[PDB]
Amino acid sequence: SLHIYNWTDYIAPTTLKDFTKESGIDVSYDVFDSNETLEGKLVSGHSGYDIVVPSNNFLGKQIQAGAFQKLDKSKLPNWKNLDPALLKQLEVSDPGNQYAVPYLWGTNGIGYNVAKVKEVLGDQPIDSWAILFEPENMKKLAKCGVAFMDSGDEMLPAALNYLGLDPNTHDPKDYKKAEEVLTKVRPYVSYFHSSKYISDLANGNICVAFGYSGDVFQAAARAEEAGKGIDIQYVIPKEGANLWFDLMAIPADAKAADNAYAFIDYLLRPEVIAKVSDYVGYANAIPGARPLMDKSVSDSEEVYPPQAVLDKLYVSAVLPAKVLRLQTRTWTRIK
């Protein structure tokens, strides 16, 4: 048996069935919708999981905390399937990539109901964080429903970047500026939640959301399958946005490590990770998977962004505890 703690909506419907059928390893699969939730479960050091899937910045802090056991790469024959350039980018969080294996990666941005936003805002381009961070826009959108993430790590750096400030800043003066932006639009935010926004966008309960790329794409697909003419779109705003990577790691106290290795090695296979990306709308770190993927996914400049776009994006830094406390206190006052 194998216990996995992963993000919501982050796997294909038959990925687990296919693995179990091929390996004879059964899976207990639990989900969370925010890094803060996972971090909560790891802080104890007894979160009895064999695989967990933190983002790059959280992974860095958890490695410093000794949350994970070092990878025995001999039990990952498929490691050589990984993009070396991407592995190098993650070494900032995991020097020598000793603890974690890239899984999926993507951006945050704005997901929105085209018709409903046009109705409240007219025929203007939806291409700025201003849509969510200016009261002039939000006071109008409020009535049709708006979702923000339940996460300081997401919202504060986004607001900072919108203001032209360093999303990874250590400066309390900057955090107070970001706080002000967020507090001013809070009355218009329907709710803070990091997964509810998918079904809400799909069925029209909300018109706009702060969202992750693939999540928004899943919502748009559900909306098409619904057959009610709902058009959901994802936008990486002109001010740029977060570029993040999710990675699988094995808790230090894991009971079934060998089973964890089998699972991860299975996911490093091009045809397996292709099916996942095809379903969830997120890029993977396996160059061999591209030729096998749906062109609708691989040829999207929002799933796989070109250099002109990647240049506007910020990667979340592994921050000192002092700044993370600042971030937390600021978010609580807002939330």
Look up tokens 């009261």; give the residue: 135
Cα separation, 111 vs 217, whole angstroms? 9
What domains appear along the chain, each with residue ranges and CATH number? 1-105+245-304 (3.40.190.10), 106-244+305-335 (3.40.190.10)
Indicate the SS3 state at residue 292. helix
Please tell me whether 113 is known to bind a ligand. Answer: no
The one-letter amino acid at 72: D
Nearest to 287 by CA among 305, 268, 306: 268
Question: 204 near 83, Cβ under 8 Å?
Answer: no
* Cβ contacts of 237 within 8 Å, gap of 6 or more: 109, 110, 127, 128, 129, 131
CA angle (113 as vertex; 109, 114 as ends), nearest 5: 100
Contact 58, 13 (CB under 8 A): no
How far is the C-alpha of 286 from the C-alpha of 271, rounded, in Å?
Answer: 10
Exposed, middle or buried: residue 132 (CB in 10 Å: 0-12, 13-18, 19+)? Answer: buried
Whole-number Å distance between alpha carbons of 183 and 201: 23
Q: Helix, strand or coil for residue 288? A: helix
What the block records as the tokens of 57 is 């910045």
296: left (phi over 0), alpha (psi -120 to 50) or beta: alpha
Separation between Cα atoms, residue 314 and residue 330, nearest integer Å: 21
Tokens read off for 257: 């490590």
DSSP summary character for residue 195: S
- What is the tally of helices (H) and strands (E) in the chain? 16, 11
Residue 215 assigned to a binding site: yes
- 265 membership: H or E segment, kind and range: helix 257-267
Judged on CB neighbours under 10 Å (0-12, 13-18, 19+), 143 is exposed
Q: Is 242 annotated as a binding residue?
A: yes
Which residues touch 215 (CB under 8 Å, ≥6 apart)? 9, 111, 195, 197, 198, 281
Confirm or deny that 8 is annotated as ligand binding: yes
Sign of CA pseudo-dihedral 137, 142, 143, 149: positive
As a whole number of angstroms, the distance between CA 70 and CA 249 comes to 9
Residue 141: left if φ>0, alpha if ψ -120 to 50, beta else—which one?
Answer: alpha
Question: Long-range contacts for 197-205 (Cβ within 8 Å, ≥24 apart)?
Answer: 197/111, 197/147, 198/9, 198/222, 200/145, 200/147, 201/111, 201/112, 201/113, 201/232, 202/226, 202/230, 202/232, 203/228, 203/230, 204/113, 204/116, 204/228, 204/230, 205/145
Could you give the dihedral angle defined by the CA atoms of residues 160, 163, 283 and 14, in that order, rounded to the nearest 10 degrees?
60
Spell out the residues 6+ positions from residue 8 whose beta carbon is closer than 8 angstroms to its own.
31, 32, 33, 195
Rg of the Cα atoms in the chain: 20
Return d(Cα 17, Cα 35) in angstroms, integer.
Answer: 26
Q: For 234-260, give one letter per residue: b (16+ CB within 10 A) or e.
A: bbbbebbbbbbbbbbbbbeebebbebb
C-beta contacts of 304-312 below 8 A and 24+ residues apart = 305/107, 305/236, 309/236, 310/243, 312/236, 312/238, 312/239, 312/240, 312/241
Which regions of the chain does DSSP assign to beta strands (E)?
2-7, 27-32, 51-52, 100-113, 146-148, 191-192, 208-212, 232-235, 242-249, 283-284, 314-315
Residue 169: CB atoms within 10 A of its CB come to 20
